[PDB]
Design a protein around this ligand. Structure first.
Ligand SMILES: C=CC1=C(C)/C(=C/c2[nH]c(/C=C3N=C(/C=C4\NC(=O)C(C)=C4C=C)C(C)=C\3CCC(=O)O)c(CCC(=O)O)c2C)NC1=O
Ligand SMILES: CCCCC/C=C\C/C=C\CCCCCCCC(=O)O
Ligand SMILES: CCCCC/C=C\C/C=C\CCCCCCCC(=O)O
Ligand SMILES: *[C@@H]1O[C@H](CO)[C@@H](O)[C@H](O)[C@H]1NC(C)=O
Ligand SMILES: *[C@@H]1O[C@H](CO)[C@@H](O)[C@H](O)[C@H]1NC(C)=O
Ligand SMILES: *[C@@H]1O[C@H](CO)[C@@H](O)[C@H](O)[C@H]1NC(C)=O
Ligand SMILES: *[C@@H]1O[C@H](CO)[C@@H](O)[C@H](O)[C@H]1NC(C)=O
Ligand SMILES: *[C@@H]1O[C@H](CO)[C@@H](O)[C@H](O)[C@H]1NC(C)=O
Ligand SMILES: *[C@@H]1O[C@H](CO)[C@@H](O)[C@H](O)[C@H]1NC(C)=O
Ligand SMILES: *[C@@H]1O[C@H](CO)[C@@H](O)[C@H](O)[C@H]1NC(C)=O
Ligand SMILES: *[C@@H]1O[C@H](CO)[C@@H](O)[C@H](O)[C@H]1NC(C)=O
Ligand SMILES: *[C@@H]1O[C@H](CO)[C@@H](O)[C@H](O)[C@H]1NC(C)=O
Ligand SMILES: *[C@@H]1O[C@H](CO)[C@@H](O)[C@H](O)[C@H]1NC(C)=O
Ligand SMILES: *[C@@H]1O[C@H](CO)[C@@H](O)[C@H](O)[C@H]1NC(C)=O
Ligand SMILES: *[C@@H]1O[C@H](CO)[C@@H](O)[C@H](O)[C@H]1NC(C)=O
Ligand SMILES: *[C@@H]1O[C@H](CO)[C@@H](O)[C@H](O)[C@H]1NC(C)=O
Ligand SMILES: *[C@@H]1O[C@H](CO)[C@@H](O)[C@H](O)[C@H]1NC(C)=O
Ligand SMILES: *[C@@H]1O[C@H](CO)[C@@H](O)[C@H](O)[C@H]1NC(C)=O
Lengths: 286, 673, 98, 197, 49, 49
């Protein structure tokens, strides 16, 4: 149930659009430079520059019988504990976010509710200014200034991500917690739980049968309690992750696909736009 | 002369009435679609822990069996026969003829043990024979087939008819014929089965969990009809290959006559300790000479002393009287257990005692043995005190012949004409350690050569198990023999013959998933292996030991290497669909068309292109009104439990024992409310 | 309830019918601890499922407040498009919004 | 225990033994009782071996009076004037089953007539319990006496005197709620019984 | 007769009050929650026996 | 903390005072498992709250 819920979470956050828009050949719309949040054909990878930095910020299974024959992952696998791959490859999630950014840069807000409608980017930005309380002319007599400030803020975001820091800390917290729980299961397997030893082989090698079921049942109940505790903690963590994923889904529907009037829902200030980027086990909104 | 047992050979396992239930059990069963041997119109067919015997005839040619070991005068044998209008079961010493015929089958019978006569009396007659705990179980069933030239397919349940208390070493058998027919023989194996009962209590359908991945899945979820999807399954496959026994090479018989047939033992206060080393503990050689009145072992079963090797063997010897032998035990009080000889609370070893009235007792009176009855404290475990200082009730020293000054030692007076509580007894206490240290006193077990890189059963100085033996690069200290993992699992061992280090690993590794449509749709499955290449599944799963229907699912043409594993049993296509069964890593599977299971890359969505321009706009000119539904859950069912009915039911004894756990149900009631 | 948890049988009557007091109590306490553990597992899963149901019901309550009793400007909160109205209908253990 | 008589690990039976020196021991010796002390393996439980082939430490057969070829049986010699460790004892071992099969050896307990449709304490062939007995439509094979449900509770029984099948049901059923105001308000309560009309 | 009771001890170790857990359903409730004081509402007691 | 979980008493002192080393270990193990189960249940309910 938990393993199905994870894929449901990812699909309900990222698969919002019903059409996969092409990345435009030009990445310069009215003075606004979009090249740092869109894929490029010259770079061998398929994701963006900021997505490259995000995927390199968070640190993180190809073991076989010939591969390992004191690794912790092989010790997990020899005791019956396995990790399953996600259904969506990171390249598909990058494709989804590229489609979202292209639709925002080309069609505006209209593709969220109905079919997409083309509009020049400066008129879309004037419409965004109009929905805040500022008049339409304030964009048009100050267009180059606003474009330059947008480009400078994008460059500042890129520099602050490419420097070393403790951002993206909660995704790292999630992966650390999962690894710690699996290691706790592996290390809890050396308790005797009230028996003479924690090995089955030596308590079968030297005991009569009737006493041997007594010791075996003590070990069995101990290990069964260990597995039950692990499953309960996993269910609680899954509920927390599901609440976070629901908040991410409504944030993408109300802030990438439209303009929000809710205070501090999307940034600090008066909301103009939002752009999604993919992160390991997560999303990043600009 | 080789055929298949197409889902036959199932019998009632108990005497308990069950209706409309699934009952999963494990016993000696004939495997589904396994090899049977046909005999058509008789040698000594070997017996191996039960057989399935089927007879197809039209003139009643098969008329019984002979069971035994040697088919000779020199062992007990049982005949089960069907002379005309009787059924005779007889267990005796038989001079069995080479050709038994006309239901004549023996020459002379003597030393008869068992005998039974029943009351006076196109077909398929089926029997199951199994030997267990001195009982021969015979199960019978019958089907009215019309015509056949082989064993016909079908399903039938056999009922118990005989449970004979023979106590016979049965290792061979031979059928008995008159002088066209056919009889088929199959062998039973220890297997797990699942059985379905009707509303009348009849076993009508069964599942064996070792032939297909599908049936492994069916009894993995305890159901007979499975839905559509992918499921993780268990490991109901692998059997170990062989046996490896490694023991130190010691040729010396161990000094039993030096320890037990000694000329003299010491007193109980001056008991003596000896070290035993480099010997073979074959105590069977004492079975004509020395007989023990007390023999009691602590920490180890007495029936396994032949299968172990012992580390630090010491023997303590002394002589007591008959009443004091009960004090040689871990927790005891008395004069011997307090002032003479004490055993630890966690003692592991053996205590042996025997009567020695013909040696240590004289008609005049033997006064050479002593014991201490006065001390200022109690001895520690395995502590000795052989002083002879005179004793005083206060701590001051004193002169011997004065007042309140005593000699601390006392004499055993051993006469020939006393009761057995005042007769001398010789006691030997053996102390050792097990399975944690290098050892040099082993049992008489024989060794076997090493088998590497294969899942075998091993025995290294008494340490049994199952795993894969590979060479290691570790370095052991001279005082170390075993090595432990982070889960305290033994992974390293030094070979006691050729002193090298070996690494023991499990032979089960990786998961197996079963992709299936509905069981009503088809009976075809695909199998996904996560953590292997399928260049290299043959080494990983030990494919050689499996049934033929399992080797078609390990190599072939429909293999396909995905990123989640590789998939066997599905056809790969280059057309992308939106998917229903998610395999993983972008791969999905479905049941398309000659139906087959196909695997593809899932589709993200439709393709589009919007022409960006700096001076054109798109404006809608018309509209529609749409109504969309959305369904949301609000509540679930409110429930309540009663601990007393659930745990104890109607018993008042359990209800009184449940007053201790009184606070553990008010909490559950509070949560549910 | 048909497990024995390392005892001779799962029936209390069979333990009481052929064992005397100390041995019978030793066998009975294993069953008591196992059954009490089964009840605790059931209650824990019920608590987690109740938390999920409560989150869903809070979302349904705010949806009926903001979409039946008014017109919402939030994107995709109520339907696919520009929201005009909404109607509620009752369902077994739930609600349906049109 | 190795070569003559072995018991299983899970026995369920009783061992009885008593001293018989006045019968089995004579003054000059009694050499009629024998035991095996040489064998090529151990016995299985409840298994017998009554052969008298000469024994060799290797498996090869041999002539009796030669070297390394022994007779595997050995004599108890019982005398009247020896110690109690060498005196003869007679041993009877009784093996049986309990509360699983039809039973033909019972205790001296007295019986009572049946009572239908009432919660009573029952004792059926040693199976004790408390419940309500009703006639059944189940069909029992002749080798079956008891029956179990999905939770391994004994629900069906065959009467040992007049062989009919009966269901056993519990006699506690239905949930009860108590409606009260505060204790400091009043001591009067109301009772609600579900599952009753 | 064999009966379950709930006893109260005062500040000086003297038994001053008791509840007989089989007299009426209110006393069954009191013995179940282990208190002499029951708040207002409806409570599920044990099944009918 | 007053339940005994199938032991002879809930006090560690009086079972170390009169029982003997391996019997004492056998009883104390049952007490240890019961008290660990109590702590586990408390922590799980705290997480849900
Ligand atoms: C060999 C041991 C042997 C066994 C185990 C045995 C059991 C056995 N045979 C029966 C009938 C019968 N038994 C036979 C004959 C045979 N039955 C055989 O197992 C064999 C080998 C023959 C052939 C010689 C026949 C023809 C019937 C009549 C079945 C019928 O028509 O209803 C029955 C009564 C079943 C019934 O009538 O409802 C039993 C219990 N009889 C035996 O002789
Ligand atoms: C040579 C001194 C003893 C050395 C033994 C070494 C290790 C102990 C191994 C086995 C103990 C067997 C003791 C004799 C058992 C007699 C059984 C009997 O007849 O009832
Ligand atoms: C005469 C009444 C004594 C009452 C003592 C009460 C409690 C003490 C219990 C046991 C100790 C005295 C019993 C004698 C034990 C003899 C021990 C020995 O010598 O091997
Ligand atoms: C957009 O920004 C990138 C990164 O600074 C820069 O290399 C590129 O030249 C910019 N685009 C234009 C048209 O200047
Ligand atoms: C075998 O698997 C390993 C680990 O995934 C991989 O690196 C290697 O390329 C594979 N080899 C083949 C031949 O598939
Ligand atoms: C079973 O019999 C078949 C004959 O069709 C044979 O090919 C196969 O090798 C046999 N099985 C074994 C394990 O020998
Ligand atoms: C047993 O049979 C063999 C074979 O003929 C025979 O030599 C021997 O004398 C027989 N023994 C007895 C006791 O009849
Ligand atoms: C076996 O059958 C034959 C012929 O039917 C009969 O003479 C003989 O007495 C039978 N055996 C016994 C032990 O009755
Ligand atoms: C077996 O028969 C022989 C006669 O050949 C006899 O001496 C011996 O006592 C018999 N054995 C038994 C156990 O009756
Ligand atoms: C008798 O059974 C034993 C096992 O209990 C076996 O080792 C032996 O080989 C059997 N006898 C014969 C003659 O095969
Ligand atoms: C049970 O037996 C009755 C007796 O005639 C039969 O009618 C019924 O079909 C049987 N039940 C099943 C499931 O076949
Ligand atoms: C061995 O024991 C026998 C039995 O009495 C005795 O006769 C013999 O002298 C003993 N051998 C030695 C060397 O003490
Ligand atoms: C056992 O003791 C007897 C007594 O004389 C002897 O004849 C026999 O040879 C001994 N057994 C062995 C195997 O030496
Ligand atoms: C006996 O053991 C020694 C180890 O001390 C080993 O070197 C030798 O090879 C062994 N003997 C044989 C025949 O293998
Ligand atoms: C488009 O508008 C016309 C009139 O304005 C109307 O008749 C027609 O139904 C509309 N199109 C659709 C698809 O409803
Ligand atoms: C005695 O038991 C038999 C069953 O074997 C039964 O038929 C008979 O009625 C019983 N006697 C009485 C007096 O009930
Ligand atoms: C209770 O019994 C009456 C009498 O016929 C009936 O009308 C009513 O429906 C019953 N109550 C229920 C809940 O069925
Ligand atoms: C307890 O004892 C003290 C002094 O004996 C007394 O003052 C007080 O009233 C007593 N309280 C009760 C409840 O008995």
């Amino acid at each position: 149930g938990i393993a199905a819920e994870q894929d449901r979470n990812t699909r309900e956050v990222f698969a919002q659009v019903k059409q996969m828009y092409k990345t435009p050949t030009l990445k310069y719309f009215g003075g606004f430079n979009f090249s740092q949040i869109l894929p490029d054909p010259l770079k061998p990878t398929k994701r963006s520059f900021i997505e490259d930095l995000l995927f390199n910020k968070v640190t993180l299974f190809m073991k076989q019988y010939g591969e390992c024959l004191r690794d912790l992952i092989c010790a997990q696998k020899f005791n019956g504990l396995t990790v399953l791959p996600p259904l969506l490859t990171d390249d598909m999630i990058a494709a989804y976010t590229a489609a979202l950014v292209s639709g925002t840069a080309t069609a505006g807000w209209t593709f969220g509710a109905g079919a997409a409608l083309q509009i020049p980017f400066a008129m879309q930005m004037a419409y965004r200014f109009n929905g805040i309380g500022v008049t339409q002319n304030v964009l048009y007599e100050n267009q180059k200034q606003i474009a330059n400030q947008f480009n400078k803020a994008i460059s500042q975001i890129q520099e602050s991500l490419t420097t070393t820091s403790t951002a993206l800390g909660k995704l790292q917290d999630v992966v650390n917690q999962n690894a710690q729980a699996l290691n706790t299961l592996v290390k809890q397997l050396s308790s005797n739980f009230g028996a003479i030893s924690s090995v089955l082989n030596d308590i079968l090698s030297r005991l009569c049968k009737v006493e041997a079921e007594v010791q075996i049942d003590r070990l069995i109940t101990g290990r069964l309690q260990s597995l039950q505790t692990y499953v309960t903690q996993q269910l609680i963590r899954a509920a927390e992750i599901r609440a976070s994923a629901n908040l991410a889904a409504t944030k993408m529907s109300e802030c990438v696909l439209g303009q929000s009037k809710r205070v501090d829902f999307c940034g600090k200030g008066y909301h103009l736009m939002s752009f999604p980027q993919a992160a390991p086990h997560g999303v990043v909104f600009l | 002369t080789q055929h298949t047992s197409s889902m036959r050979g199932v019998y009632y396992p108990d005497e308990i009435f069950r209706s409309d239930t699934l009952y999963l059990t494990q016993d000696l069963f004939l495997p589904f679609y396994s090899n049977v041997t046909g005999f058509h119109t008789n040698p000594v067919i070997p017996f191996k822990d039960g057989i399935y015997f089927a007879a197809t005839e039209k003139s009643n040619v098969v008329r019984g069996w002979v069971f035994g070991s040697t088919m000779n005068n020199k062992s007990q044998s049982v005949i089960i026969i069907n002379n005309s209008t009787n059924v005779v079961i007889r267990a005796c010493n038989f001079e069995l003829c080479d050709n038994p015929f006309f239901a004549m089958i023996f020459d002379n019978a003597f030393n008869c043990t068992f005998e039974y006569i029943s009351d006076a009396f196109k077909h398929l007659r089926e029997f199951v024979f199994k030997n267990k705990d001195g009982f021969l179980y015979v199960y019978k069933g019958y089907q009215p087939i019309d015509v056949v030239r082989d064993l016909p397919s079908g399903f039938n349940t056999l009922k118990p008819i005989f449970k004979l208390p023979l106590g016979i070493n049965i290792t061979n058998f031979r059928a008995i014929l008159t002088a066209a027919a056919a009889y088929f023989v199959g062998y039973l194996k220890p297997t797990t089965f699942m059985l379905k009962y009707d509303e009348n209590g009849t076993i009508t359908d069964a599942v064996d969990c070792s032939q297909n991945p599908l049936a492994e899945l069916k009894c993995s979820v305890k159901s007979f009809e499975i839905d559509k999807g992918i499921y993780q399954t268990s490991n109901f496959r692998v059997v170990p290959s062989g046996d490896v026994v490694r023991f130190p090479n010691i040729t010396n018989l161990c000094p039993f006559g030096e320890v037990f047939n000694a000329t003299k033992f010491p007193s109980v206060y001056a008991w003596e300790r000896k070290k035993i080393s480099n010997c073979v503990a074959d105590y069977s050689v004492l079975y004509n000479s020395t007989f023990f009145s007390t023999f009691k072992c602590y920490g180890v079963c007495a029936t396994k002393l032949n299968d172990l090797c012992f580390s630090n063997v010491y023997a303590d010897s002394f002589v007591v009287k008959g009443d004091d032998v009960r004090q040689i035990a871990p927790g005891q009080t008395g004069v011997i257990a307090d002032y003479n000889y004490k055993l630890p609370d966690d003692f592991m070893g053996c205590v042996l005692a025997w009567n020695t009235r013909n040696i240590d007792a004289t008609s005049t009176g033997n006064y050479n043995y002593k014991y201490r009855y006065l001390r200022h404290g109690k001895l520690r475990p395995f502590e000795r005190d052989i002083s002879n200082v005179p004793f005083s009730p206060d701590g001051k020293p004193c002169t011997p012949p004065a007042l309140n000054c005593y000699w601390p030692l006392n004499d055993y007076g051993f006469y020939t004409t006393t009761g057995i509580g005042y007769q001398p007894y010789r006691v030997v206490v053996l102390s050792f350690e097990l399975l944690n240290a290098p050892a040099t006193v082993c049992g008489p077990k024989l060794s076997t050569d090493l088998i590497k890189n294969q899942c075998v059963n091993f025995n290294f100085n008494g340490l049994t198990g199952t795993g894969v033996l590979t060479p290691s690069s570790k370095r052991f200290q001279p005082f170390q023999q075993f090595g432990r993992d982070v889960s305290d699992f033994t992974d390293s061992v030094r070979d006691p013959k050729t002193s090298e280090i070996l690494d023991i690993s499990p032979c089960s590794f990786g998961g197996v998933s079963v992709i299936t449509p509905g069981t009503n749709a088809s009976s075809e499955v695909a199998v996904l292996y996560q953590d292997v290449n399928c260049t290299d599944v043959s080494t990983a799963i030990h494919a050689d030991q499996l049934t033929p229907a399992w080797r078609i699912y390990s190599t072939g043409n429909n293999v396909f290497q995905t990123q989640a594993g590789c998939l066997i049993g599905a056809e790969h296509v280059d057309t992308s669909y939106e998917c229903d069964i998610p395999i993983g890593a972008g791969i999905c599977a479905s049941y398309h068309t000659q139906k087959s299971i196909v695997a593809y890359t899932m589709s993200l969505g439709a393709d589009s292109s919007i022409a960006y321009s700096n001076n054109t706009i798109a404006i809608p000119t018309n509209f529609s009104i749409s109504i969309t539904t959305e369904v949301m859950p609000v509540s679930m069912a409110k429930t309540s439990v009663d601990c007393n009915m659930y745990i104890c039911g109607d018993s008042t004894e359990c209800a009184n024992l449940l007053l201790q756990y009184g606070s553990f149900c008010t909490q559950l009631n509070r949560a549910l409310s």
